[PDB]
Design a protein around this ligand. Structure first.
Ligand SMILES: NC(=[NH2+])NCCC[C@H](NC(=O)[C@@H]1CCCN1C(=O)[C@H](N)Cc1ccccc1)[C@H](O)CCl
Ligand SMILES: *[C@@H]1O[C@H](CO)[C@@H](O)[C@H](O)[C@H]1NC(C)=O
Ligand SMILES: [K+]
Ligand code: NA
Lengths: 259, 30
DNA sequence: GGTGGTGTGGTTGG
């Protein structure tokens, strides 16, 4: 996250860290959507141009965290993966269309003050909230800026970062890039005019873009950090998988293969 | 507590607001 | 240290 701030404790209890077993490294963000299901970006699991093709066994999921590196004794919970489900129409070749994947945990996770699922929007809620100029919130342990020295320890936060960003009109999104945008995506971020800044960055993928309903006081996950060009550049915007447009695939996977 | 999705134990369930959630709610007006 | 840098802890023991 670029130009965000330190999360408060328990601010995103649905935040999940997706972690590579060997070597031991942060891979991506993710979100907890029930006691047994975690949502993330497909490209975190499968991206052939970077030689990425993980199975269930390469990965851990870590829930309840605040610190990026410290094992948070008695706070965080670590689950193993039963099964990964990547969207069958995920397009890694061109533009990461349908950049979405579900991970089933081997055992349900016990909720706590630090661990708690986010809601997925119904049709009404999507339409009401997914409007240009409305702000959502993005969270992650990814890089604090576009990195120009190949590798740094100064690029990384010690604790979970948060930033609020406005949703942007589809024409502005479309003109800001030559990558082909789809209805399975939306973009967010300040315009160069608006003076304020912020973006997600590399490492934040799979993390949620959430909005608080002014009707029922609940947090809904409207997006998944998916892609961008650089981070926090003027005239660029962060791209997010559009969660509601893919909800039928999400329901289908959870109903069919579901405990 | 049953389908209490999206309500944080340390915030909404305690009637505490986080430091920036005000900003999001203001965006629905302006 | 242990799946950081200091605590009669902390978002948590000794
Ligand atoms: N908001 C932003 N400015 N950036 C968000 C980047 C999030 C990261 N996503 C990425 O790095 C994705 C994955 C492939 C290349 N990529 C990108 O974002 C490439 N920069 C642009 C791109 C987009 C589509 C297709 C090819 C290339 C995830 O951590 C993985
Ligand atoms: C990803 O990797 C595994 C190797 O275990 C392979 O079986 C699977 O077919 C791969 N998928 C793709 C689409 O390359
Ligand atoms: K300690
Ligand atoms: Na920008």
């Amino acid at each position: 996250i670029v130009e965000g701030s330190d999360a408060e404790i328990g601010m995103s209890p649905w935040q999940v860290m997706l972690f590579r077993k060997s070597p031991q490294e942060l891979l991506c963000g993710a979100s907890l959507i029930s006691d047994r299901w975690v949502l993330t970006a497909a490209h975190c699991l499968l991206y052939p141009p970077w030689d990425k093709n993980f199975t269930e066994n390469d990965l851990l999921v870590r829930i309840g965290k605040h610190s990026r590196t410290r094992y948070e004794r008695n706070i965080e919970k670590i689950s193993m993966l039963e099964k990964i489900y990547i969207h069958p129409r995920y397009n890694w070749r061109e533009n990461l269309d349908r950049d979405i994947a579900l991970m089933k945990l081997k055992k349900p996770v016990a909720f706590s003050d630090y661990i708690h699922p986010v809601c997925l929007p119904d049709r009404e809620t999507a339409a009401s909230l997914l409007q240009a100029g409305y702000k959502g919130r993005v969270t992650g342990w990814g890089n604090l800026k576009e990195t120009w020295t190949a590798n740094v320890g100064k690029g990384q936060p010690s604790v979970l970062q948060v930033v609020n960003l406005p949703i942007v009109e589809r024409p502005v999104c479309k003109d800001s890039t030559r990558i082909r945008i789809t209805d399975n995506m939306f973009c967010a971020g300040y315009k160069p005019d608006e003076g304020k800044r912020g973006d997600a960055c590399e490492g934040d993928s799979g993390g949620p873009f959430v909005m608080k309903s002014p009707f029922n006081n609940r947090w809904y996950q409207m997006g998944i950090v998916s892609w961008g060009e650089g981070c926090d550049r003027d005239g660029k915007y962060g791209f997010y998988t559009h969660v509601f447009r893919l909800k039928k695939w999400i329901q289908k996977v959870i109903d069919q293969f579901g405990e | 507590g049953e389908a209490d999705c999206g309500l944080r134990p340390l915030f909404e369930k305690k009637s505490l607001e986080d430091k920036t959630e005000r900003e999001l709610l203001e965006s629905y007006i302006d």
